[PDB]
Amino acid sequence: SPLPWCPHLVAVCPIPAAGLDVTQPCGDCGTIQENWVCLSCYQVYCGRYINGHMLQHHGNSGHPLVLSYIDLSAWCYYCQAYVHHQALLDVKNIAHQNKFGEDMPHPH
Ligand SMILES: [Zn+2]
Ligand SMILES: [Zn+2]
Ligand SMILES: [Zn+2]
């Protein structure tokens, strides 16, 4: 149902060894709600339903792909579609572990 590939996956960068914090607030407004993490630079900003700071970040950086801290979906702002691919497996997994803990039935 998401796209199996997009031309912007090349811009997905290595996950920091620091890992991900799915409860990290928006870097601009500080909201705890509807945050996304940028898969290029790993700054965290809010979704369109709050103050739209991730969309603003896309506009001012050109960074393509972002991961939702709500449902762990990856969205590309250029393709205007959700994407799932091997390049996104590391981040989605580390995010899932941080969000739900290790005691989960989901394949890591
Ligand atoms: Zn915000
Ligand atoms: Zn970015
Ligand atoms: Zn794309």
Swiss-Prot record:
A zinc finger (UBP-type) spans 4-102. Residues 47-49, 75-82 are annotated as: Ubiquitin binding. It is found in: Cytoplasm; Cytoplasm, Cytoskeleton; Nucleus; Perikaryon. Induction: (Microbial infection) Up-regulated by the presence of SARS-CoV-2 N protein during viral infection. The SARS-CoV-2 N protein enhances HDAC6 stability during infection by reducing its proteasomal degradation, leading to elevated HDAC6 levels. Zn(2+) 2 binds at C26, C29, C46, H53. Phosphorylated by AURKA; phosphorylation increases HDAC6-mediated deacetylation of alpha-tubulin and subsequent disassembly of cilia. Ubiquitinated. Its polyubiquitination however does not lead to its degradation. Zn(2+) 1 binds at C6, H8, C76, C79. Zn(2+) 3 binds at C38, C41, H57, H63. Histone deacetylase domain 1 mediates the E3 ubiquitin-protein ligase activity. The primate-specific SE14 repeat region contains seven SE14 repeats with the consensus sequence X-L-X-Q-T-X-S-E-X-A-X-G-G-A and mediates binding to valine. Forms a trimeric complex in the nucleus consisting of BANP, HDAC6 and KHDRBS1/SAM68; HDAC6 keeps KHDRBS1 in a deacetylated state which inhibits the inclusion of CD44 alternate exons. The complex is disrupted by MAPK1/MAPK3-mediated phosphorylation of BANP which results in BANP export to the cytoplasm. This facilitates acetylation of KHDRBS1 and CD44 variant exon inclusion. Interacts with SIRT2 (via both phosphorylated, unphosphorylated, active or inactive forms); the interaction is necessary for the complex to interact with alpha-tubulin. It is linked to Chondrodysplasia with platyspondyly, distinctive brachydactyly, hydrocephaly, and microphthalmia: A disease characterized by chondrodysplasia, severe platyspondyly, hydrocephaly, and facial features with microphthalmia. Bone abnormalities include a distinctive metaphyseal cupping of the metacarpals, metatarsals, and phalanges. Affected females show a milder phenotype with small stature, sometimes associated with body asymmetry and mild intellectual disability. Deacetylates a wide range of non-histone substrates. Plays a central role in microtubule-dependent cell motility by mediating deacetylation of tubulin. Required for cilia disassembly via deacetylation of alpha-tubulin. Alpha-tubulin deacetylation results in destabilization of dynamic microtubules. Promotes deacetylation of CTTN, leading to actin polymerization, promotion of autophagosome-lysosome fusion and completion of autophagy. Deacetylates SQSTM1. Deacetylates peroxiredoxins PRDX1 and PRDX2, decreasing their reducing activity. (Microbial infection) Deacetylates the SARS-CoV-2 N protein which promotes association of the viral N protein with human G3BP1, leading to disruption of cellular stress granule formation and facilitating viral replication. Belongs to the histone deacetylase family. HD type 2 subfamily. This is Protein deacetylase HDAC6. The lineage of its organism: Eukaryota, Metazoa, Chordata, Craniata, Vertebrata. The chain holds residues 1109 to 1215 of 1215 of the full protein.
